[PDB]
Amino acid sequence: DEDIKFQRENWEMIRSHVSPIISNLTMDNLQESHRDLFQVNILIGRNIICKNVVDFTLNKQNGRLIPALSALIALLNSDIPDIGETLAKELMLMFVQQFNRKDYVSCGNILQCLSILFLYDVIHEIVILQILLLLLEKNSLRLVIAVMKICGWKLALVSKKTHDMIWEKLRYILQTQELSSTLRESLETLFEIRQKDYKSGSQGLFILDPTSYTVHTHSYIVSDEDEANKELGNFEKCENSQLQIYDMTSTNDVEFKKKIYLVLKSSLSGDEAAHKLLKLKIANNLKKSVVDIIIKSSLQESTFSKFYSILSERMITFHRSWQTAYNETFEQNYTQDIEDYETDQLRILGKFWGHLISYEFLPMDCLKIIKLTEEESCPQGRIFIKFLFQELVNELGLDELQLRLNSSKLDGMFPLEGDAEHIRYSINFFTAIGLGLLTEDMRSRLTIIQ
Amino acid sequence: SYNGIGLKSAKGSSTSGHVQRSLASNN
Amino acid sequence: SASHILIPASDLSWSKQTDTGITHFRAGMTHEDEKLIPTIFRYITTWE
Amino acid sequence: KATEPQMVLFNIYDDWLDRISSYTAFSRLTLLLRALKTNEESAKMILL
Amino acid sequence: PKTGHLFLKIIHTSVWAGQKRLSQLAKWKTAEEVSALVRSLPKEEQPK
Lengths: 450, 27, 48, 48, 48
Fold this sequence. Notes:
This is part of a larger assembly, with one copy of chain A, one copy of chain B and three copies of chain C. By secondary structure, chain B is mostly loops. Chain B is 0% helix and 11% strand. Chain C is mainly β. The interface between D and E is medium-sized, with 18 and 15 residues. Strand 1 of chain A pairs parallel with strand 1 (6-11) of chain D, so a sheet runs across the interface.
């Protein structure tokens, strides 16, 4: 037959689609695990989906992924109340079997599965607490405490009178009865969470609204028959308006520039100017824009001042994001903005950066970006190096400056590797500055080559 | 807390006497 | 204006013995929280 | 450059408002716009 | 004229490609867009 044929590989693929969904169910993937399941025929594949979730819960690999598992079942239950109807039936029989088998591993697998079904309003309260009576009839205490850690949140919200009486009966055992040792600290841990109020047992995937889940609170008990419809999991033979205004005005960036300029101009000292900037609590994406205003306020002066340098150091030693805005601004000043600046403004820049480089608020490795070349050195860029290095010589002294230029590996300033016309350029640069003592290593390499 | 910092009063002072800890002070 | 600034404040017992630095500020002359007045000292080149 | 129907805000007074009144800026504007209307190319030489 | 704010409503060529008698269709589009502009402003900002 081709009709018995077609209905079998249709029955095969429906099996072969649900099982990779159930294996690939995780948090932040529930709605997509629900999407590809909804296009699969759940109504025909009714025990195909029931046997895939019950076996995957029980495997003891899971136990962590139970709160994601029941969240799909609640997505099923509001779509179809009949899907979770049989799926709530089998988990009752699974416990009633394995409790009479005394299977503590497989019971507590189901016992965490049923409690999160109650948290997701799949099952009633009466099915849960009547399990809690049959567990509290014998010992079974390593099972029943793991239930009441998870289920006791919602259950004390709904059925608080009966649920206290269970707490009332359970408390009789710890006080006036001898028990085993290792289970004893499990019994009193259940009373330790009562006073901390269950804030470590109520986190999960409530991914339906309290009305978006059509509330099919099934009123089962574990004392009734549940019909065991295993005959569906086999094969059978069916004869069946925002207005997007572009803003070119940039009033916002002008109004923020006035606020920062006024913080600076109202301050006596740079310690008190940095305090007011740190008080504003500027966002991370605006901090590069703040270092840019501070430098442009400083170049409007006639001379350098310690105010802008003292203020800058207070921001860098506050938090490492202000450190990053100063490392980013030093490259913007050298690579983009050099052409814009007049010679009087390059005195204030090189003394500003050379002061922060010499007291180590910037690394000496920030000078790595600088490359001395006939072709790729700006005339206004070379005026920046002279003013930055005159400041480094004055603060450190020349003998201390040779220690730090040796410790860094900056090749564009001091090339020892070749290209002998560039070695000619650098020695000629630094002796014009007044630093021939720095050049003496490069002077050896040139006479060898010529 | 007062912690030994501040004016004894803002009465002869012409100020309100409001004190705040400096955020630019590293420690 | 010279006196809308925040004035540096420190522990007075320690300050007589060693320079403590600036750890606290007190208020100078009162204004609204957003509303600063510039000070003459920021407009004068220092002698050095 | 537009390929869609779209709204754009501009500021035709640039930053004149800091130092003139809006009476004065509206007079500067409509003299600049009147001279670009009477002779566009020689008006642009004056600005540039 | 007080603030200098310029609301430039760009009109793409795609609106004109399917009609005729455009010289009085144009003024009916302008009154749509100006009235759509006035409604989007809050009533503190709407013009007298």
